[PDB]
């Protein structure tokens, strides 16, 4: 049904450290501040906006 939002929501609520791999193979690490339909906000030392279209995978680190 819907899997993406619960997975990301749960990762956020529980403040879980995640690795975000980009489609070019670059790995980003932080925690999920928020997300909407197109982007995921990732906090570490500064918050950065990652476009979903550039993401391959999100996995707990």
């Amino acid at each position: 049904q819907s899997l993406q939002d619960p997975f990301l929501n749960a990762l956020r609520r529980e403040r879980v450290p995640v690795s975000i791999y980009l489609v070019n193979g670059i790995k980003l690490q932080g925690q999920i501040e928020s997300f909407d339909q197109f982007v995921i906000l990732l906090k570490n030392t500064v918050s950065q906006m990652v476009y979903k279209h550039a993401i391959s995978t999100v996995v707990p680190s």
Copy 2:
């Protein structure tokens, strides 16, 4: 749609070890835990969310 979900649900139901090849050539392995319109869930040691847009092919390993 009408071909994807059954293919994916069969693998999920039957606990088939699968290879997911990404568009960047990276090959991920595991079993399909779940999926929605946009993402596929692959389990072994951690559950990782893979965006379909980053996927090239899904195959039994």
Copy 3:
């Protein structure tokens, strides 16, 4: 319009061996088993689900 379905049907209906080139230069080969809006099913040694967004060209082998 729709050019894609007939082209692929003809290959499926008539068991033409086909070479499928992916956006990362990799080339798959087999027989078009079926397809829907988003995926093609290559059947060769195995049934594999190829996302069309990962495909660059489809050529008769």
Copy 4:
């Protein structure tokens, strides 16, 4: 749409030998047999189906 369809139609109608550069760096050559919303059919020797999403540029050779 209003610039793309005319551009492609002229090439097909006038039997112009074309070069289709793909995003992956491959260059396909041939004549445009036909096109629709999603693909271009490019001939010669055989007909090859090209997904527009894989194309960067289309130019007469």
Copy 5:
């Protein structure tokens, strides 16, 4: 829309020499003849059709 069409239209009416960078690092050069919703026509010697999906940046050169 409120940003893209005015930017491109100004470059077109004013015949500004432009660099169009593709997502693969290819840099095209020319002037904008025309655009629609999906493509940009870039001309110097020969008008070439560039798909927007393959474009990263458009810059006055």
Copy 6:
């Protein structure tokens, strides 16, 4: 509705220096002059139009 728009707007309004990482690992730097649904205009020397589909991350620099 948006997380994306507020994030980009705050950076724009406060002239916050940003790094825009493209999907091909190329890094752009500047200030966000403006944006719409599909593009971002990034300031000096000469403003350049960047397609969002080509962007991986926007980071305050």
